[PDB]
Amino acid sequence: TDPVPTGGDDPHKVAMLGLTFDDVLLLPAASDVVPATADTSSQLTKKIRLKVPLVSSAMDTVTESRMAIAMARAGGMGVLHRNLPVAEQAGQVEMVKRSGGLLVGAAVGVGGDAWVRAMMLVDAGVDVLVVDTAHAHNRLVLDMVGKLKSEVGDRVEVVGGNVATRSAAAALVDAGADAVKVGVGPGSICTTRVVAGVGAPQITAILEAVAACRPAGVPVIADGGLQYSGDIAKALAAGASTAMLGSLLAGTAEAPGELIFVNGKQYKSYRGMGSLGAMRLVPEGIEGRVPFRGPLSSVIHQLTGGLRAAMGYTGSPTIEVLQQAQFVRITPAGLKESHPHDVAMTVEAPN
Amino acid sequence: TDPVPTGGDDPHKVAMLGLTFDDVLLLPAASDVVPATADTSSQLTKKIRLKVPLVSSAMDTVTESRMAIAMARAGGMGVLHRNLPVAEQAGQVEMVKRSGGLLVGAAVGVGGDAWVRAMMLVDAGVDVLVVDTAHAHNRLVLDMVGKLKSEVGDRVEVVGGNVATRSAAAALVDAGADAVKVGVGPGSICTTRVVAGVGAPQITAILEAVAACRPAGVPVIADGGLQYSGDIAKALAAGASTAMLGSLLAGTAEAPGELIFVNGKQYKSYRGMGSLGAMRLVPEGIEGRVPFRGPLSSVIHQLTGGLRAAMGYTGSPTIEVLQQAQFVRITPAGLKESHPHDVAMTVEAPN
Amino acid sequence: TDPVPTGGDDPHKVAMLGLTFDDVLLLPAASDVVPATADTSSQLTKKIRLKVPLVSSAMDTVTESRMAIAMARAGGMGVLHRNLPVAEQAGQVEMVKRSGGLLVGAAVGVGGDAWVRAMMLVDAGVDVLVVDTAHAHNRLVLDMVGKLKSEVGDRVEVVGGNVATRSAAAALVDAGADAVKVGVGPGSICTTRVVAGVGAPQITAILEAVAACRPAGVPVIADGGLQYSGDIAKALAAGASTAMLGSLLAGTAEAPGELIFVNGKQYKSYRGMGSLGAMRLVPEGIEGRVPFRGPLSSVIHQLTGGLRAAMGYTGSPTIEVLQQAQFVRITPAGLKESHPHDVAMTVEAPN
Amino acid sequence: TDPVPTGGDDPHKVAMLGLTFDDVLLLPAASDVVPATADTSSQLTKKIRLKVPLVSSAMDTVTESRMAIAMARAGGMGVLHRNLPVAEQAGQVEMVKRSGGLLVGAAVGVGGDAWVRAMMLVDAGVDVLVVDTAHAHNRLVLDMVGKLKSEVGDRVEVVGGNVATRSAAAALVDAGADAVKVGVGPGSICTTRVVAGVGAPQITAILEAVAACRPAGVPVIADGGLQYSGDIAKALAAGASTAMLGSLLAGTAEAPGELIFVNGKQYKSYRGMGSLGAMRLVPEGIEGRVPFRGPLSSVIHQLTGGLRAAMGYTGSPTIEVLQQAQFVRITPAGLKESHPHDVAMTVEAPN
Numbered sequence A, B, C, D: 001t002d003p004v005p006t007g008g009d010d011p012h013k014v015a016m017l018g019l020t021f022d023d024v025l026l027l028p029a030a031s032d033v034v035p036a037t038a039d040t041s042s043q044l045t046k047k048i049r050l051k052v053p054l055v056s057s058a059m060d061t062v063t064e065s066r067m068a069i070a071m072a073r074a075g076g077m078g079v080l081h082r083n084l085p086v087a088e089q090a091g092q093v094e095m096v097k098r099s100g101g102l103l104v105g106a107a108v109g110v111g112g113d114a115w116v117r118a119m120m121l122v123d124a125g126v127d128v129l130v131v132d133t134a135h136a137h138n139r140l141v142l143d144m145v146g147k148l149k150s151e152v153g154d155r156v157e158v159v160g161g162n163v164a165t166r167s168a169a170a171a172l173v174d175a176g177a178d179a180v181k182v183g184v185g186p187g188s189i190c191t192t193r194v195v196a197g198v199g200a201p202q203i204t205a206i207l208e209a210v211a212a213c214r215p216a217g218v219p220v221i222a223d224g225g226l227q228y229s230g231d232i233a234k235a236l237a238a239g240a241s242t243a244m245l246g247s248l249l250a251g252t253a254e255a256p257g258e259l260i261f262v263n264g265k266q267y268k269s270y271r272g273m274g275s276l277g278a279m280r281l282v283p284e285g286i287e288g289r290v291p292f293r294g295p296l297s298s299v300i301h302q303l304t305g306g307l308r309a310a311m312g313y314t315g316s317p318t319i320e321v322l323q324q325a326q327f328v329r330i331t332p333a334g335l336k337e338s339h340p341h342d343v344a345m346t347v348e349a350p351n
């Protein structure tokens, strides 16, 4: 019997071919939709629907109270980070609720201290708890999701993550999750791929997680690796219902941290939660900076405008129709020309 | 049942593998043709044949009256842009007609104002109307094509675009189009691919559109992404009958705009019609610059000379025979060496 | 009959598709393992098990007595290089044995002088002899392995290498090798690939060698091309039992050579054993430098920490379970984003 | 019926997948050969065998009398260029013959003037005539080969080229060629690929030409694209019997032209024979420069040493055995590491 062409005698050792966002484009289709008439609303969880299908990352350089307020007013939601005392995180929930009863979420870990944290957040009025781990395919994480749903599941929605396979998503569904968050490897500040050699390209990870979650009616949150507004449209067409953004929002006025004026240009700090600085395990994230981008309201406007353009080209009046769109796969030669190919740019572009 | 190797259980979710110009080369074949004896004439529309199979883009940094006159004298044609008052566009048609009854086209949009524009252009003597949209697979665009053909189709030829699929090209054929223009995603100044995440690699887009148009006798115009004279030969071998050029002609003396002397080198402005500056929707084009290239007559001479070389290598005495030539697909390692690989260039090359 | 699609009529002329480390990632799986509870021990040879599955390269810029002592104290082993007189190499074995009866290996060549060298190393107390060649698929190399095993095989373990195919690994197994070392082409300082045009991508080379060695109970040493801690996890998941490191350890305090302060940064010399300088045959290696990395103990700590993270993500309590993990294949677009993609790094990262 | 996955309904429109040198490596195999014992002799034509399987390009910056003398003394051969008067080219043949009756070849074109040139070269004692064209798959070129063989074929050997397909090679075999030269697209100074969009990756072109020539006993000359000594071994393993070199020899003392000292480094001119300067048709080559490399004897020594290393790794005692060796295909990730990957080079390497 002949060998597998890439080596050895086991045809399942190399189990899949993984696609990322840069590997695909959306095909145009017959359409009566124009960008202005598209409806961008979508489910965050079984019970919660958002007007704009975007949430901010649970990171100490992205989401505290000011970002959560601005995201909710823009039609999305923020998830407050958990790298601070319980009493301070619960107080940031109250500040958001004092600005109009806006929707808000908050991250928790696994174990006894994370349980005390979760109960204080519920008492403060939080709408969504996010069980927030590097590897959710573990019985202790599944137990945490199920115990929260049993005790406070009537009052608050419970998200679990992160996963990158069909089998991991199915395990969270069986544990009672109200949404499943997908992403191991893809984030802009992630070094899991080179430190551990572990990960999954994000278009294939979404397609596999959706194969388990869609038949059960559980929404999927696509978390990490989104670099352009067009990546949001690709993630939702692969079957996700919302997208979570770190890098794209870390440059805004509302993100925690001060402005950095260096060489006449401006920046703000952005770091992984598994970086040396955030943990103060070998680190699985870096500490860096991103360009300053101005007010959050204007960033969200440009991102939703690109999504609306994609809905016009694909004939999708709603996000549920966009989830049925088709891809064309591209080669390396086709990606290099996608970033403005060979015409000296001179003027600023908003998107 | 096993999953699709790239994810999920649907084998049509990733529907195609899209090739661009850099993915293919033309194979040499048995030939009695030398570059000097090749015949470069080809159909622009059902009724109009050109001596040179090239047209200039309908852009406000590429084609007004001076470019249209020079293109027609060179054996091709210009399409006048529509980012100006109706009375001015109609007057540029008259200026072209006063220089010898040369062929000329002009762009129009969709709706009531575009209808008034179209009727004034016909009264001024235009030969070709181009229904000029970002997404032609839409009933309002198909209605515009059909209504023009019904009212003035005896006097003027009617083009519709742009499309990137077999089904979209078939819909324009059924509506009465005299030619179909192909290109969503590929242009040098296009950002649709990253803003909306939408597009189609241009060799596959041409092959699919031709599968619908050739059996009906409708010519295909390949519009966008052409960077070298060899790309013209590849587009026509994939089945197109003419090519439309923006970047390659924006540097010429006849293009609208003034010369830009900067750092001892010279440039001219070139911008997408969906850029912020041209529209004064989120933008789907950039504003930039290209190197100055001299007179149009000399640029067209070099481009047609490269086409003639391809016809010699493939044994094609006419464009209709070139449309039957074969490709070899190349890998990433083969493209890097195609751009002069590893020999410090010292002297200027015209092409 | 149709041609093979890549040329000619022989479907075995291009025999395989070879994958390297950058072509694959490890898939997360169901896990009760956390990085702290993983067991990193593994067989170096049939009779010798190490606490940490790493050995240092047999190179005159990587391993003399100080590196061998530090590697053994860290739980791994060093292999002393053979580019020095027999009496000096045997004396370095004694120095290692005087620091606590630590484990140590030493390289030898093929022929009569290499036999005298081998006997002196055994008299000095060496634990492992490494028959150390550029191409081990040769009857003289197989004879050397078998004769050593016959004469001193009761006292010392005998390794042979290097190979890159299933048939070559099988020949070393039949000759009596206690471990098989894999790697032709992949090393950071190797130029065999461009000087001779010969080599084998290392993930496929490991998969093929393991197909011969695992059924016989012979461990495989993955030698060359490892650039990050995650590459160690990939090599062991492909079926290797230990990894050998040159570049990653050449920057440490214990490596032979002096520090190089240049432009405020620090370096140390690193060169192939087939470079012009080491041989003083056309050269098949280069002479260069690598950044200074500090003490060996700290480098090994970071490398084993990344391995432990991979064991947590894959649910592997032991190295024998990690050898059963699965890969996802990635495209060129997915690799570019793996190296910290698009976030200006500002702070130092240990790994 | 479903479409072809890359577009259209014709499965032969994209006829082949073309491999270049960077797409493959030679696999090591069982061997009793060491580099010193390999036999590098090989057929140039049916009747002429060389000691070293290399010839110099017929270019006015590579081969006049001094290069032809040095190549023959090194065991190879030179082909004198034809961009000069007939009387001068014939006189350079005599100069070579006055230095010891060394072997020499000379290029000619097609037509009446090329016939007069050919007869004068034969009278001057030339050993090989090379019918030297950009596209040999043409009845006028085949007639020239056949008429030369009929008139002077008893005294001189007749080569024809260049081709890049099985059918073109078969036509030259039927016309009586004593060897077939392969290469359309691959040369370092070639711009046919971007000017005409025409070419064929060189490993696939050799495999296809050999499928026609080997069964007839006609040797194949691999011409263009060779960048390293390892590329020579790959070309011969694909089935060629000799290789022709331009760039690799244009830097030597014996090449025509003067040394260029610029910025403390040294260069020499190198230009295509279809460049603007050589023709004084649109140009299909560039004019440039290459680094100075010293005496030819030393360059040939390093190139043959790399070939000898490949013969050791593959177990090939002769070139006829190397022509039976096997390849592994590599991905883009595997090529980037082949050029010395990540170790600051400090010292000069001869090869």
Ligand SMILES: C[C@@H](Oc1cccc(-c2ccn[nH]2)c1)c1cncc(-c2nc(Cl)c[nH]2)c1
Pocket: A033, A034, A035, A309, A310, A311, A312, A313, B132, B133, B134, B135, B192, B273, B274, B275, B281, B282, B283, B284, B285
């Ligand atoms: C922003 C602008 O981008 C482009 C892109 C390509 C061509 C042109 C253009 C303008 C004039 N001639 N060609 C404009 C634009 C203008 N209107 C409609 C669209 C649009 N519809 C759907 Cl559905 C999706 N997106 C986009």
Ligand SMILES: C[C@@H](Oc1cccc(-c2ccn[nH]2)c1)c1cncc(-c2nc(Cl)c[nH]2)c1
Pocket: B033, B034, B035, B309, B310, B311, B312, B313, D132, D133, D134, D135, D192, D273, D274, D275, D281, D282, D283, D284, D285
């Ligand atoms: C411009 C010039 O380009 C080359 C390319 C490769 C080799 C040479 C060359 C010249 C002399 N020796 N080799 C010239 C050229 C000269 N003539 C004919 C052609 C030609 N025919 C067909 Cl059909 C297509 N294109 C091209």
Ligand SMILES: C[C@@H](Oc1cccc(-c2ccn[nH]2)c1)c1cncc(-c2nc(Cl)c[nH]2)c1
Pocket: A132, A133, A134, A135, A192, A273, A274, A275, A281, A282, A283, A284, A285, C033, C034, C035, C309, C310, C311, C312, C313
């Ligand atoms: C170093 C640190 O890396 C990350 C990576 C991604 C997300 C986060 C994070 C922290 C807080 N929220 N999200 C941390 C970390 C923290 N703990 C556990 C792990 C881990 N477990 C297994 Cl199994 C393997 N590796 C990794």
Ligand SMILES: C[C@@H](Oc1cccc(-c2ccn[nH]2)c1)c1cncc(-c2nc(Cl)c[nH]2)c1
Pocket: C132, C133, C134, C135, C192, C273, C274, C275, C281, C282, C283, C284, C285, D033, D034, D035, D309, D310, D311, D312, D313
């Ligand atoms: C020039 C030199 O290149 C290397 C490459 C890899 C490892 C080493 C090495 C030296 C000492 N330990 N390891 C040397 C060399 C030394 N001898 C033999 C060969 C050789 N044989 C065959 Cl067959 C083909 N080429 C190559």
Ligand SMILES: O=c1[nH]cnc2c1ncn2[C@@H]1O[C@H](COP(=O)(O)O)[C@@H](O)[C@H]1O
Pocket: A057, A058, A059, A162, A183, A186, A187, A188, A189, A190, A191, A192, A223, A224, A225, A226, A244, A245, A246, A247, A248, A271, A272, A273, A274, A275, A284, A285, A286
């Ligand atoms: O240190 C880390 N390592 C790996 N992933 C991380 C780390 N910190 C945060 N993440 C993930 O990265 C996402 C942000 O990705 P981005 O939007 O591409 O910048 C977050 O929402 C987390 O899922």
Ligand SMILES: O=c1[nH]cnc2c1ncn2[C@@H]1O[C@H](COP(=O)(O)O)[C@@H](O)[C@H]1O
Pocket: B057, B058, B059, B162, B183, B186, B187, B188, B189, B190, B191, B192, B223, B224, B225, B226, B244, B245, B246, B247, B248, B271, B272, B273, B274, B275, B284, B285, B286
């Ligand atoms: O703003 C824009 N976005 C996208 N495509 C555009 C825009 N403006 C013009 N185009 C297209 O780009 C083509 C020019 O492409 P180029 O020849 O590659 O520069 C035009 O003929 C249009 O089809």
Ligand SMILES: O=c1[nH]cnc2c1ncn2[C@@H]1O[C@H](COP(=O)(O)O)[C@@H](O)[C@H]1O
Pocket: C057, C058, C059, C162, C183, C186, C187, C188, C189, C190, C191, C192, C223, C224, C225, C226, C244, C245, C246, C247, C248, C271, C272, C273, C274, C275, C284, C285, C286
């Ligand atoms: O000159 C040489 N050419 C090729 N391979 C070499 C040479 N010297 C050492 N090696 C190999 O390269 C390995 C080190 O690879 P690295 O860890 O990628 O730097 C060694 O353990 C040897 O197997």
Ligand SMILES: O=c1[nH]cnc2c1ncn2[C@@H]1O[C@H](COP(=O)(O)O)[C@@H](O)[C@H]1O
Pocket: D057, D058, D059, D162, D183, D186, D187, D188, D189, D190, D191, D192, D223, D224, D225, D226, D244, D245, D246, D247, D248, D271, D272, D273, D274, D275, D284, D285, D286
């Ligand atoms: O102008 C030209 N265009 C294309 N190919 C050329 C030209 N001049 C020479 N060649 C070819 O290029 C070969 C040299 O290729 P190199 O060794 O890669 O530099 C010659 O032997 C010719 O076959």
